[PDB]
Each structure stands twice: as structure tokens, then as C-alpha cells.
């Protein structure tokens, strides 16, 4: 209904809103729109021992939203955290998805089930089961351009030729892997072939950045004068 | 005669003095006036330095019946040689707003008077054309399309203004307008781009109607105008050639330079914001210091 204000709002207050926006859009199966908000939330908020709670929960939600895309957080995130001994089931989520192993995942959300369920993040960890396969098939698209259907079934431990073919097609409906199946010759072909500076798209990519720089140009001019009316009216020697 | 006379440089005096001749004789409503144009010649660049009326008379019964006075012409040449040794006969202006076929006959008089092909200068003083206030024409003889004879014709040349030093000084001074086009800031050239587009279309329109009229209303087929259009079409960029494809890539690259340049000004602005939020901080300190000081001055009166 778009009625949130922005006039009297605060560092905490806007950080809080965004966190609600994250949580709604992720569980509604759109992780691009969810991730937009969570990044904003950490950003507004101060960084203190009194903000610790807010930051702590923001980090927890962030990892999973990102994992759901099939894109992975870096190891330095967790390592240099002072908040790392509560992000330990979350670190294992990162490793397990990436390495594509079905059985590690199984163990992780069973071992750390109370932890995940306390914090309410256990429901998004269920859809991260799917991402184990999806992330493993992705690595394979990067590493191999032409690969038999057979070799793929051994790598992720799947039964039939048929099984891999159902999984891959769905995964490239989303566009995560970036391939096309050739069951006319029995191999999968990787379709990423770049040539993006030879497309017409780059003008369009710059136009959004230019538009953000115009946004700061306005925000600077209007902000600056607002204390200054009062200040010239204020008594002085 | 003379062959070299290719570009015509036109002082800002010339357009204004012809304008003044028309309206100071009370020849109006297409009673034409013929005056001479004097200057230098015998060379590619043709300077018209000065211009003056001559006596002329015109008939509306047959239009190829007129008076031109030769005796005044002789006296003018004698007088003005002393004024400047840079005025000799270079042709004659015709006051316009249009070219006549009767100006073809009047031309044979000026061709006799001076050994060069004489410039015909149209000075449009009624200004119904948005461009061309001056048109330059030198009558020449050439053999003419469609099996036809050596005919007398007027061939258009460049009619340029470049101005004299002398002239520039009065021109800018009188000026107090922001000019039709000057091509200074970005504001002037954004106007200009849109003006140019209307410009391209207006010329092109007349051409549509010429081709229509050859095949419907039987004006004679002149192969020079058809040939120029061939040349137009062979310098027309074709999409999907390597030339056109390059244009697209270059647009990305110039817009990368612009993207960065817009961000490099946010930096300049960001410096200001901080300097003003510092200024405001000092005004605060000043204000408190006075409010304390009123007490000290209140106390001094009780004290003494």
C-alpha cells in the first residue's frame, strides 16, 4: 500500500523495515528481491556491541538467501567474524552446498536441527536441499563443456540416465547452470559463450549507474540547505 | 574574363546596406532595385566590401523592359577608388527576394562593364527563408541536358559570411541577444541538434515534390539533381555492415567515460556537503558564546 515514511525515520528504524522485507520475499520464492533488502538492512545499522543482536540475525538470514540463489558466500566472512561460533551451522551450509554432497546435507540439518529451528531459519534450509544438486551441476557446467550423461550420474550418485536429464532441464529453466541437453547424441553442452561487449546491452548497464549518481547529486543539494535556513536565522556576534 | 571566384565572402555591411537601399527608395512589393557591388576579385575568394544603389526602372507590361543608368556607374568608380584602392567592379546586387529570368538579360550589361564573370548577389530583404539571406550566383555558359543548346544560366556558389575585422566589432556590440546559434554551452547545442533535424527534413521535402512533378506535371528532367541523389544513396550507411556495427561498440565506450565523469563530480559535491556541515557547526558555537556574554555585560552594570 506503500505508505512507509522516509521523513522521520532512523538508522535503526529503516534497518528494521528491510529485515521484514527480506523475510517475506525469500519464503515467497524470489531471492533476488529478498537479497536487495537484507544488504540494505546491514548497511543502515550501526556497528556496536549494542547492535550486536540486530547484526547477528542479519548475517544468519543473509547466508541462506544467497545459497538459495546458488551463489556461495566466501570463507573470510565467517573466519574474521567475532560472531563466528553461532554462524558455525551456517558455515557448514556453505561448504556442504558447494561440494554437492547429499549425505553431508542430511547430517548437518539433523545435527543442528534445534539451532536452525530456534532461529526460524530451518524452513529456508529445506529448499537448500535442492541447491546441493543445483550447485554441483553448475560446477560441472563450468569445468566440462561436453560431458556424457553417464559420467554425471556417477559424480552426484544418481541411478538412471533419466534422473540427471529431469534435474538439468529444470535447472536451466531457471538459467542457473547455463546449458542445453542434447539427447540426440547423449551429452550436455554448456551455452555460455560470452560476447557481452558485442551485444547492445552495455549502454543500458551504464544508464542505471548514471541514474544512481544523479540520485546522490539531488540528495546532496536538498540536504545541505536544510540546516542552513535555521542557522542564518540563529543569533550570532 | 576570370574563372576563379568559387567562394563568396560577404561582409555584414553588405546585407544591411542592401536592406537600407530598398526601403530608402520606397521600392517595395517587388519593384526591384539594382545597385553595384564593389570589392576585390580575380581569385577564388570574392570579398564584397561596399555596395551602393544605382538608378533603375521597371515595367509591369513586359518584364524585359527596364532602365539602368550607365553614367552614374562611371562617376561612382572614380570617387570610391580614392576612398579605398580595394573597390573595383566585381558585379552587381539584385535586391530579391527571388531570382528572375529577367536578371539574365540585365547581367549582359555588367559582363560588358567588367572583365570578370560578374557576381549576382541576391540580398533577401523580405526574409521569408529561414536560411540563405544572401545567395551568390555567377552567370556562366554551359551545354544543357536533354539534347539542348549552350544556354545562359546562373550557378550557385557558397555565399558564406566570414566577416572583416572591422565589421566584427560593430556586429557583437549591437548584439544583445543570445544569438540564433552560437554553439557555446550544452544548452545551446541541445537546441541545435533538434534544430538540425528539422533542417534536414525541410530540404528533403522540396526534393520529394520535384520528383513528383517530373512524372506528373512535366517539368524538364535535369540529370544533375538525379545524379546527386545517387551519390546520397551510396554514402548511406547500411546496418549489419562492419562500419555500422563499430558505431554501436564506440557508444558503449564513450558512455563508460561519461559514467565515470558523473561519479567524479559526486566527489566534488561531497566535499561541499562536508564544508557546509562544518560551517553550520561553527555558527552553533558562535551562537552559544553570545548567550553566555550577555550575562557578563548585565553583571557589569550592577557591579559598578
UniProtKB/Swiss-Prot annotation, chain A:
Residues 15-195 form the PCI domain. N-acetylated by NAT1. The modification Phosphoserine is found at residue 199. Residues 225-237 have a biased composition (Basic and acidic residues). Acts as a regulatory subunit of the 26S proteasome which is involved in the ATP-dependent degradation of ubiquitinated proteins. The 26S proteasome is composed of a core protease, known as the 20S proteasome, capped at one or both ends by the 19S regulatory complex (RC). The RC is composed of at least 18 different subunits in two subcomplexes, the base and the lid, which form the portions proximal and distal to the 20S proteolytic core, respectively. Present with 16700 molecules/cell in log phase SD medium. Belongs to the proteasome subunit S3 family. This is 26S proteasome regulatory subunit RPN3. It comes from Saccharomyces cerevisiae (strain ATCC 204508 / S288c) (Baker's yeast). The gene is RPN3. The chain holds residues 256 to 492 of 523 of the full protein.
Swiss-Prot record, chain B:
Keywords: Acetylation, Phosphoprotein, Proteasome. It comes from the Eukaryota. Transmembrane segments: none annotated. GO terms for cellular component: proteasome complex; proteasome regulatory particle, lid subcomplex; proteasome storage granule. Residues 8-143 form the MPN domain. The keyword Ribonucleoprotein does not apply. One of its GO terms (molecular function) is metallopeptidase activity. It holds the Pfam family JAB. Gene3D superfamilies: Cytidine Deaminase, domain 2. One of its GO terms (biological process) is ubiquitin-dependent protein catabolic process. CDD domains: MPN_RPN7_8 (cd08062). N-acetylated by NAT1. The modification N-acetylserine is found at residue 2. Acts as a regulatory subunit of the 26S proteasome which is involved in the ATP-dependent degradation of ubiquitinated proteins. Present with 19800 molecules/cell in log phase SD medium. Belongs to the peptidase M67A family. This is 26S proteasome regulatory subunit RPN8. It comes from Saccharomyces cerevisiae (strain ATCC 204508 / S288c).
Amino acid at each position: 500500500k506503500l505508505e512507509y515514511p522516509h521523513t522521520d525515520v532512523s538508522s535503526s528504524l529503516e534497518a528494521r523495515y528491510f529485515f521484514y522485507l527480506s523475510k517475506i520475499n525469500a519464503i515467497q520464492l524470489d531471492y533476488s528481491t529478498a537479497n536487495e533488502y537484507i544488504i540494505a538492512a546491514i548497511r543502515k545499522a550501526p556497528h556496536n556491541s549494542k547492535s550486536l543482536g540486530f547484526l547477528q540475525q542479519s548475517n544468519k538470514l543473509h547466508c541462506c538467501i544467497q545459497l538459495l540463489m546458488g551463489d556461495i558466500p566466501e570463507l573470510s566472512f565467517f573466519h574474521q567474524s567475532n560472531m563466528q561460533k553461532s554462524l558455525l551451522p551456517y558455515y557448514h551450509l556453505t561448504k556442504a552446498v558447494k561440494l554437492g554432497d547429499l549425505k553431508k546435507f542430511t547430517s548437518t540439518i539433523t545435527k543442528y536441527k534445534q539451532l536452525l529451528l530456534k532461529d526460524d531459519t530451518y524452513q529456508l534450509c529445506v529448499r537448500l536441499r535442492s541447491n546441493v544438486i543445483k550447485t554441483g551441476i553448475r560446477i560441472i557446467s563450468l569445468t566440462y563443456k561436453k560431458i556424457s550423461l553417464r559420467d554425471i550420474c556417477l559424480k552426484l550418485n544418481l541411478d538412471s540416465e533419466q534422473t540427471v536429464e529431469y534435474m538439468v532441464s529444470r535447472a536451466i529453466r531457471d538459467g542457473v547452470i547455463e546449458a542445453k541437453i542434447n539427447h540426440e547424441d547423449g551429452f550436455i553442452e554448456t551455452t555460455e559463450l560470452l560476447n557481452i561487449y558485442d551485444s547492445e546491452d552495455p549502454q543500458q548497464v551504464f544508464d542505471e549507474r548514471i541514474k544512481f549518481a544523479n540520485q546522490l547529486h539531488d540528495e546532496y543539494l536538498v540536504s545541505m540547505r536544510y540546516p542552513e535556513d535555521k542557522k542564518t536565522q540563529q543569533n550570532e556576534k | 574574363m576570370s574563372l576563379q571566384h568559387e567562394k563568396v565572402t560577404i561582409a555584414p555591411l553588405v546585407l544591411l546596406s542592401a536592406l537600407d537601399h530598398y526601403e530608402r527608395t520606397q521600392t517595395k512589393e517587388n519593384k526591384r532595385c539594382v545597385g553595384v557591388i564593389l570589392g576585390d576579385a580575380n581569385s577564388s575568394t570574392i570579398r564584397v566590401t561596399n555596395s551602393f544603389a544605382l538608378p533603375f526602372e521597371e515595367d509591369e507590361k513586359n518584364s524585359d523592359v527596364w532602365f539602368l543608368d550607365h553614367n552614374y556607374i562611371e562617376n561612382m568608380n572614380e570617387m570610391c577608388k580614392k576612398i579605398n584602392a580595394k573597390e573595383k567592379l566585381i558585379g552587381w546586387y539584385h535586391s530579391g527576394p527571388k531570382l528572375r529570368a529577367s536578371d539574365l538579360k540585365i547581367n549582359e550589361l555588367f559582363k560588358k562593364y567588367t572583365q570578370n564573370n560578374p557576381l549576382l548577389l541576391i540580398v533577401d530583404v523580405k526574409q521569408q527563408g529561414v536560411g540563405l539571406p544572401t545567395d551568390a550566383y555567377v552567370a556562366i555558359e554551359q551545354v544543357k541536358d536533354d539534347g539542348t543548346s549552350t544556354e545562359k544560366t546562373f550557378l550557385h556558389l557558397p555565399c558564406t559570411i566570414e566577416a572583416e575585422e572591422a565589421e566584427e566589432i560593430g556586429v557583437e556590440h549591437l548584439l544583445r541577444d543570445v544569438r540564433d546559434q552560437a554553439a557555446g554551452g550544452l544548452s545551446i547545442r541541445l537546441t541545435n541538434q533538434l534544430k538540425s533535424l528539422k533542417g534536414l527534413q525541410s530540404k528533403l521535402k522540396d526534393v520529394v515534390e520535384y520528383l513528383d512533378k517530373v512524372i506528373n506535371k512535366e517539368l524538364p528532367i535535369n540529370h544533375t539533381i538525379l545524379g546527386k541523389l545517387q551519390d546520397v544513396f551510396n554514402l548511406l550507411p547500411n546496418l549489419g555492415t562492419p562500419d555500422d556495427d563499430e558505431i554501436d561498440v564506440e557508444n558503449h565506450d564513450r558512455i563508460n567515460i561519461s559514467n565515470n565523469l558523473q561519479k567524479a563530480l559526486t566527489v566534488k559535491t561531497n566535499d561541499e556537503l562536508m564544508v557546509i556541515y562544518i560551517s553550520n557547526l561553527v555558527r552553533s558555537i558562535i551562537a552559544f558564546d553570545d548567550l553566555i556574554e550577555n550575562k557578563i555585560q548585565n553583571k557589569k552594570i550592577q557591579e559598578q
